[PDB]
Structure formats: C-alpha cells, structure tokens
Amino acid sequence: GSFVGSIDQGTTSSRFLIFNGEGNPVASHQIEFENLYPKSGWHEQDPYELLNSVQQCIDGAMHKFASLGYSKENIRAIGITNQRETTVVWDSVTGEPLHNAIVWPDTRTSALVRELKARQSADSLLELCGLPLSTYPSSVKLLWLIQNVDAVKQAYEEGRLAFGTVDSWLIYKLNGGAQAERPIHVTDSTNASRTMFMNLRTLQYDDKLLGFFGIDRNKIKLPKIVPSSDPEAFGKVATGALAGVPIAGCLGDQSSALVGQCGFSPGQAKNTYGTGCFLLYNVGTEPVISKYGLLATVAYDFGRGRKPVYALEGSIAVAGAGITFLMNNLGFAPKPSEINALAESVLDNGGVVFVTAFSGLFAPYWIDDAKGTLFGITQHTTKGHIARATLEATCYQTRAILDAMEKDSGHKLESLAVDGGLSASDLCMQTQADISGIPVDRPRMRETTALGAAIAAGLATGVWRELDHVKESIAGREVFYPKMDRKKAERLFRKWEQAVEMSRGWVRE
Amino acid sequence: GSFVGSIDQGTTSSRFLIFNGEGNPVASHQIEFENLYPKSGWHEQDPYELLNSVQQCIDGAMHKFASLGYSKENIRAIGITNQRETTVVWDSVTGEPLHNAIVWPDTRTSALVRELKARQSADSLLELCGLPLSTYPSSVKLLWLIQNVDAVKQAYEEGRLAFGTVDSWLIYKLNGGAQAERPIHVTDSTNASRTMFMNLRTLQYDDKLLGFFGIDRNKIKLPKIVPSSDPEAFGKVATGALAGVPIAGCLGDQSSALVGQCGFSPGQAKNTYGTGCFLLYNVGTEPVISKYGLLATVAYDFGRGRKPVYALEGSIAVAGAGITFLMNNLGFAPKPSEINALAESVLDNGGVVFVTAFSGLFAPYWIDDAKGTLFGITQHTTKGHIARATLEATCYQTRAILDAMEKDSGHKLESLAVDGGLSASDLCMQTQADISGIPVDRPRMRETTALGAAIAAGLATGVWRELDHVKESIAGAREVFYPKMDRKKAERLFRKWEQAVEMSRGWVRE
C-alpha cells in the first residue's frame, strides 16, 4: 500500500486520517464523544466511548477513501496517537473495563499526591522517570483506583487486572482484545514515560518506581514497552474496514506533534496551541532532567538500530482561554477572528501587560499564589491594547519555557513549529518570532498531531526510509521571521518578567 | 425679600439658582462655556466667558423666576461660589483682563515649581498657609504670568496689576468694576487660603509668603480678605436683572459643598463625586497641618461674631472617570446606569480589586510610579465583578483619606455627606457605608455646592439667623445609607485593597 492511516484519539475528539507519501490527508472523519464529570475536578470517559468513536472515524474515513477509488489494499499500515496519562483498567481474562477511564486533567488524586510526596524515596523519582509527583501521571490514577474502586482492587489481588494508557487499550481492542490469538497488550516508550513506572534512561519498567507506588509487577499485567515505530509489535486491526491492516506506529499525542513538525534535531521545538499550550523540545539521544520543573519524556523511539530521542516538556494553562476570556467574560468581540483584529488595531501594547495566571504560573516560574493580573492601564488604554497584551502573554511564557529548555539541555533553540488554535493568529506568531528571535514555522496542513503517528507507521513499513526522506517528502502564511530589533524585544520581555514578579503573593490564605 | 440667589461658577459650567428659606431651588439656569487648551497641559479661560455665562444664567433663571410671579424684589441677596485657584489678572485702572485666566488644572508651572521647591524657605510654606508647592495654587500661576506675559509684567511694574481668584473677578465686575463708585476688589477667606499668600491662622496676607514668591504687596493690588458671609463687604450687583441686589456670600466651591451639606461640626465630612473626588473634613476653630499630604484650608468664615472654621482636604483622581473607562474604553455598557446594573448583577467583587491609579494615587498613598492595575482575574471573572471593583476602589480610597483626616485631626468621623456624579449609585454609597462603618447622607436636592453660597448670603442678611436655623430649615433615590456589612468582612476587603495598592507601586521605571 502507498498510504498511511492515523488514529488520533483526543481528550474531546477522536478522528482517523489517511495520508499520502507527501503527508497530505486525502480522507478524514472526526467525532466528538462524551466526557463525564461526576464531581468537581473529576474527569472520566467510558473506555468503549473512546473505542467506538475511533471505529466510526475509521469507517467514516474509508467510505470517503472508497469514493476516490481506493481500498484497504492501498493502506500499508496505520499509526495511533492518543491523549496521554489517561488511565484505563480492564479485566485481563474478559477484556472488559473495570471502571471508566480517568482522564489526565482529573484531580481526585490530590490527597494521594500529598501523601506520596511525604513518603520516603519521593526525592528520587524525578531522576528515575523524568516526572515529579502530581495529579497527572497514570501511576497515581491507577493507585487511586486500586484503593478506592473495589472491582479494581479484587481484580488486582486475583491477578486479572490489566493496566493501560489509551494507546494500549486501543491497540488491545483493535487487535481483538481477549477473544483473539496473540492478544496485544503493549505501549510505546512515549506513552510509557508518562506513568512514572518506567526508568527514563533504560525505557524499561523499574522495580523501585513500581515499588514506591506499591504496584506488584507479577500481580498486575502491565503493557509491554515497545518502540513507537515497529512493523510487528502492535499487531493488526482484527476486523472491519481495516481488517488485516497492520498497526506500526504509536506515539503520545504531544510527541506525535513534534514528529509531525519534523522536529528531529536537538534544539528543534514545537508548541501546540489549544485552551493552553504544550511545548516539547528535542534534546537528542541523551535524557535531561530539568532544574526548572520541566518534564523529561521520550520524544520518539523508532527501534531499527535507532537510539531513542528525548525531550523536555513545558505547559501553559491560559492560551486560547485568554481569547475566550476577552470574548465571553469581557464582551470585547464574539469571535476570535475579531480579537486578533482588535490587537492589530493598535500599534503596540500601549504599555499594557496581562499576566494571565488564572490558575497560577507553571514552568519555569512556579507561582501558585498569583491570579490574572493586568498592568499598565490608563484612560487611553483600549480593547486593542488589552487584546495585544493577551496575545503577548502566551509568547512571553513560551519564550520563558524555551529559554529554560535551552539552559537545561545546552542545545541552542534552532526552530519553533506551531499548530492548533492561536497558531492561526498571524500577529501572535509574528510576535513569537520577534520575542524569541527565531523563525516560527506554521504548516498549512493542520493535522500535525495525526501526521506524527502516520510517520511512525510509515517508517516501520518503508513508506519512508529515513527521517531525511520524511522531512523532504513532507516539505514538498507558513514561516514567520524575527523582524523586531532585539533591544525592543528584550525590553518587552523584561517588563513581562517584572509583571510576573509583582504578581506573586496575591493569594494569601 | 425672602429668596436668596447663588452664582455657581464652575470649571466647565456656570449656573444661577434661587433658593427659598427651606433650601429648595425654585428657579435655575446652567450654561456650559468655552475652555481653551493651547498647549498640552495648559488650561485657560477668557475671563469674560465666565462673567457673561454668569450673566446669561442670571437672565435665564430670573425669567423662570418671573414665570412664578416673583422679581428681584423677592431676592434678599445673592452669594457666589467658584472654582478655586483659577487665577485672573486685570488692569487696575481699566478693569479689563491682561491675559486669559489660568485654570486650576493648568500644568505650565511644573518647571517653576521644580525650582521653587529647591529654593530655601520652601520647607516653611506648608506650616504657614496650609498648602505645599504644586501647579495648583494661584501663587505659581500669578508668578508665571509676571515672568512670561509682558503685558502683566508692565502692569505690575507700573503699579496697575490687580490679581484675583474667580470670586474676586466676578464680584469686582458685577459691582461695576473700575467705573463703579465704591469699586469692590475682595476675596473671602476660603478662596484666599488657596493662594499660598495667606497665613492660615491669621487669615491675613503674610509678608514671608509674599516674599518667597517675590510678590510686592505695595505694587500689585491684592483683594482685601473678607468673611465668607458679610452684609456689606461684597457690595451690590450694579446692572441687569438683579440691579441693586446685594452680594453677601462668597465661598470656594468645595468649601461651599461642605456648607450645603451642613457640615458645621468637627468630624463632619463631605465627598463631592465627579471625574474624581474632593473630600473636606471639618476640624473646628483651629487649623490642622497634615502629616499625610492633606491640605489645611478654611472650611468657612461667617464673619463678625464667629470664629473661622478650618478643614482638611483630600482628593481622588479617578471616580466617575473609572465608570467612563468601563463604558468607553472597554465597552462594558453605554450608560453609567447600566454599569451599576452589572455591578449589582453579581454578589460581590469575585476576588477582584482594581487599583484605579491611572495617574498614580494622591492622598494618603502618594504613589506616582503605579498605573491602573487589576487583580484577582480568573476564567470566572465577569464585567459585573470588575464593575464592583471599580465602584469599590473609590470607597477604599475614600476611607483611606477619612482615616488620615481622623489621625491628623483627632476628631472622630461623625458624618459623611455625598453629592454629585457617582453618589447617585445606590450601590456605591451603600458600599461606602459598609467600608467606612458610618452612615452616608445623600441629599435629594442635588445642587449642594450652590446652596452653600446661598447659606452664607442668607446668614449675612438674616434669611437664616444661626447655623441650627440653617440645619433645621434645610433638613425638612434615598437619603441615608447605613452600614449593613459585618465589620470583619469590611476590614478584610480593605486590607486586600491595601495589599493591591502595595503590589502596584514600582510599575513605572525611570
């Protein structure tokens, strides 16, 4: 086959895309599924809601694939990319879930996180797995379920509990789950580096990480850790429109976006804009443990005599959310297109600085007692100035994270690719280039995340032979270049840093 | 004669009102006049623009007075109240102005005040006149004119330069000016305490004050300082619809407001809401020199048989301006009415605090390197919350100033009366009561400033015999807002305000 498919299983969305050898999607289908919020801070999904949405997107895309004269014979393989950390538990014997998936934003584990941080050896986990303790990793979600949901506890104690991130669950069921010969219970190194069970350097489950959380290896069934690109580890789709088509790629969704942007060299970074931001920074074959609260994770692992590549990761809470705040909360304008117009309406920020720390500031500032704080207001401040400061806020924090990634890794920032929500704003992307002093590359093929999984599967099956082949095949309103004098750029950043400094201490108990 | 007229000459508008014995206006007329802004920071008025606007208001109001069947035969006297500091210079022989009036917000004296602040003896001015050096007092404006307007240079050196605040210019001209027999060149104690020429304790021109600025008393003609209520010192209207009616009252406008609210006892205070705020605090018969940058001024001086009364004054730059900012700059709503509505749409400030320091903060903070700074924003913050915070900002600053006046004077806060612009917001004033822990009196008759000058003229001429007669006559939407909030919540919200203020200083760099 000449085409490659890509399952993109998201937090709010599932979709299937079929790419050609030049990385362009020829057929696609997207479905918004149900998310469940039982309590405040609780976030759950029916595991079958994830699967069935994927399956319908597969069917939907292949009907339009048929309308252009192709069949599953034309697809050489498919890759999977998925929301990370989201924790799924099922019965190893039946393959049926024992509880709804706990989605990555779920906060029901705070108390447990507090307890675990006080435990002995909690100091050592960052160095082992790349991540600190928080509500996010799958380790604490799974531990919570074992201690609070009893169908899970007894499954565990009886040796029939299976754990999986959403990739593992989808691969397991798409291969036929329990009912099938050679059942596939696997996860790729990227997804696996998000749990806190995997030694980041060896890419193997570590007994000291598993021991810290109290999960017994020979009682629970963990997914075998395999490369993100492999022609046989992931099995094949058992039934349906893709019956018999191999799965050959598997990547956590943020890693997939880095791959889709061809960020294959150290110093190459990406930012995905949504309600917030996820930033990843290729740091090469050698892992880096951050000194500024960045996450150390696997960028991609392509097996074939390939040394796995690592990344540093940072996040921003308020990006697109800031635009939503200007539209709905303040009534500046009803659509984001017009917020950008307001920002372009004025020459500069009018001295305005908006520290958008709605829920505090994360890496590298780590300021939890700040709230949204707007500086520089006068009688002559207008909506346009505030709109600019809102866009500038994300670029300032983006630079702050990229700068921290530079000092941690010692690899000079070489490029920044962007995709999703705010990346469409020409003004803010230009501002990012100006502030950071680096070109901002924005592809007009907008399905970068899905493209990453296609590349992984395509490499496993020879659609592309090397990453150099990938970049030039994919290569064949796209790049913003620094145009601001660097003195003005440093001035603007220093008053950002200052606004931040004055924002700390606002929330007193 | 049983009615009393009032000339209210303001910064943008003049007005003439006729009050009855109970303090209600029976006829009124207002005219917006022309203000000139030649340079950035320069504010001028044609002195005849203010005189004729007054004359037109008099004509307009008297026609309405005639519609009710009355004439000047029914008006016992009139009083004047005026924008303060606004400086007028005219020629002593001809009575015509030698330059445009420099109005109080004018900033052309920045340089001159910078040098004067560096002159030795400058440290002594506040203790003598109650004011510090700044762009506002008449002293720096007059000195500037003599040093930069050669027509006034020559008039001074020729001994034919006359100086006057707006009150003295109007009284002078309404009496006949140069041509009249018994020409009147006077100013009341309040307007005179805004000059920096007057010793505040003696209410006499002081040679040390005049000497500091280089003004020679035997070469310029200074207006004779007279009481704010006097049956003869102000003369009479020479011409027109009120020909022959005596002038018997004269008060600086913010002093007039305090009088109109009947703030005659120590601890009684008033706030006048406009684009900003003007607060005066009655401190009794002996002046108080502030330790918090407040101004020591004459509250009112009702002449023979009465000891002059003094006051502490503070100001807030942004009050109604904050509501304008929400409507025009942010598009929250097109009318002030509906900004209140949004603020009432929410239960509280949502954790929001708006340090409305667009031009820094004045008394008691004195922070020049802050700007407008909004705190406590989240995804759940709404226009209503920010509206509340904007109203609350004026209440927090109002309390801050009243707190300073208490510590300066040692007189417990007894009363707070309110008038003008933002005082119409039921929510803003209820909040003021909550934050300050005292009832807030809001009169239904909303021409409080003009009534102050009527009271002075009425007292001078026996329309009212004593100040308790005044209080009794006058006190005879809502009127009074009482504290509803628990004291602890009020202190918590103030300390949050103080915190926000403290975190906004240092924004501007130099």
Numbering used by the authors:
A (entry chain D): 65 to 540, 551 to 583
B (entry chain A): 65 to 540, 550 to 583
Publication excerpt:
Subsequently, by replacing the cryoprotectant solution with 20–25% glycerol, we were able to solve the enzyme-substrate complex with a clear electron density that could be attributed to the bound glycerol moiety. Generally, the same extent of the chain could be modeled as in the apo structures, i.e., for residues 65–583 with an approximate 9aa gap between H18 and B18. The substrate is bound in an evolutionarily conserved cleft within the N-terminal domain that opens towards the C-terminal domain. The carbon chain of glycerol packs against hydrophobic Trp168 and Phe342. A similar mode of binding was described previously for P. falciparum GK, where Phe271 and Tyr135 undergo shift upon substrate or cofactor binding. However, the movement of equivalent residues (Phe342 and Tyr200) was not observed in either of the presented CtGK complexes. Of note, we solved and refined five CtGK structures, and each of them belongs to a different space group, despite crystals having grown in the same buffer condition.
Here, we report the first structure of glycerol kinase from the thermophilic filamentous fungus Chaetomium thermophilum (CtGK). Overall, the CtGK polypeptide chain can be divided into two distinct domains classified by Pfam as FGGY_N (residues 65–325) and FGGY_C (residues 331–583) connected by a flexible region. A similar case is found in CtGK, which forms extended dimers via the interaction between the C-terminal domains with a prominent contribution from hydrophobic residues (Phe422, Gly436, Phe389, Leu394, Thr437, Phe439, Gly440, Ile441, Thr437, Thr445, Leu438, Ile450, Trp580).
